[PDB]
């Protein structure tokens, strides 16, 4: 029994998920960060193929599955497709664990989810940014692990999302939340939280990553 992991965000635009995943991958370079926005719609290998490819080796334990998955259908598509394809990549005794990274607290209404997301991204254009990122926010369906598809998650990490905070201060706190929760729950992945100076350095280097 080797155990493999897929980290699945539940998020919308402006939740900082790529910053968070980039920071974690900087801290743990053996993890693989697969970005949906970098895969062609006509690519032969899609994100679920690439995810399982990046779990084939004994060196390969974690995939950061970088996609919003705002609607329940998208989480169901992950579970269905990975289950259908895993035999092409893993033997079927391998324990594959899905970890939800929940960027949006389930208490949040449709309305300050909008007000938080709207204000984080503006702090020139706004025609594009108001009722067209409200196509994004309308399709959000909170995680609900009491029924399908979200009941297939093995674990849920609950992140912070505050009206109050700067969007970059919140992303750094979320990185820390994920690490500490993994320390408690999956010591095979992280035995102890890295030094804070290391986490800060890896976060600052992620804030420069779009080269």
Distance between CA atoms of 104 and 113, rounded to whole angstroms?
8
Q: Quick one: which H or E segment has residue 57?
A: none
Both tokens assigned to 175? 């990185």
Q: Give the separation between CA 73 and CA 146, rounded to whole angstroms.
A: 15
Maximum distance among all Cα pairs of the chain, rounded to whole angstroms? 54
CA 117 distance to own-chain centroid: 17
Tokens 């289950």 -> residue? 83
Using DSSP, state whether 3 is helix, strand or coil: strand
- What would the DSSP string read from start to end of 91-131? -TTSEEEEEEEE-S-TT--HHHHHHHHHHHHH----HHHHS
- CA gap 105, 113 in Å, rounded: 9
Structural domain for 80, as ranges: 1-211
Per the structure block, which two tokens stand in for 177? 């939340």
Describe the chain by its helix, strand, coil percentages, rounded to 5: 45, 15, 40
Distance of CA 107 to the CA centre of its chain: 19
C-alpha torsion sign, points 154, 148, 105, 169 = positive
The angle subtended at Cα 137 by Cα 7 and Cα 75, nearest 5°, is 30
Number of domains in the chain: 1
Alpha helices (H) in 42-195, listed in sequence order: 47-53, 72-85, 110-122, 127-130, 134-138, 167-185
Residues 183/192, Cβ–Cβ less than 8 Å: yes
Are 155 and 99 spatial neighbours (Cβ–Cβ below 8 Å)? yes
Distance separating alpha carbons of residues 194 and 140, to the nearest angstrom? 33
Q: Are strands 95-102 and 155-158 parallel, antiparallel or unpaired?
A: parallel
Angle between helices 17-27 and 167-185 (to 10 degrees): 50
What are the strands of the beta sheet with 155-158, ordered from one edge? 32-35, 62-66, 3-10, 95-102, 155-158
Instruction: Output phi, psi for 8, to 5 deg.
Output: -115, 110
């Amino acid at each position: 029994t080797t155990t493999k992991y897929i980290f699945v965000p539940i998020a919308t635009i402006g939740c900082g998920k790529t910053t968070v995943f980039n920071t974690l991958n900087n801290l743990f370079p053996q993890w693989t960060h697969i970005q949906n926005d970098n895969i062609s719609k006509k690519a032969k290998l899609k994100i679920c193929d690439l995810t399982l490819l990046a779990l084939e080796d004994d060196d390969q334990s974690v995939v950061l599955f970088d996609r919003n998955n705002s609607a329940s259908r998208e989480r169901r598509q992950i579970f269905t497709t990975i289950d259908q394809k895993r035999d092409e990549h893993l033997d079927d005794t391998v324990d594959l664990k899905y970890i939800a990274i929940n960027f949006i607290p389930e208490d949040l209404s449709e309305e300050e989810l909008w007000d938080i997301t709207y204000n984080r991204v503006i702090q020139l254009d706004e025609n594009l940014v108001e009722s067209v990122m409200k196509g994004f926010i309308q399709r959000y369906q909170p995680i609900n692990t009491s029924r399908s598809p979200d009941d297939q998650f093995d674990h849920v990490i609950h992140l912070k999302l505050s009206k109050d905070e700067n969007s970059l201060k919140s992303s750094l706190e979320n990185v820390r939340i994920i690490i500490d929760d993994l320390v408690q729950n999956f010591p095979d992945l992280i035995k102890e939280k890295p030094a804070d100076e290391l986490i800060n350095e890896c976060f600052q280097k992620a804030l420069d990553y779009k080269p």
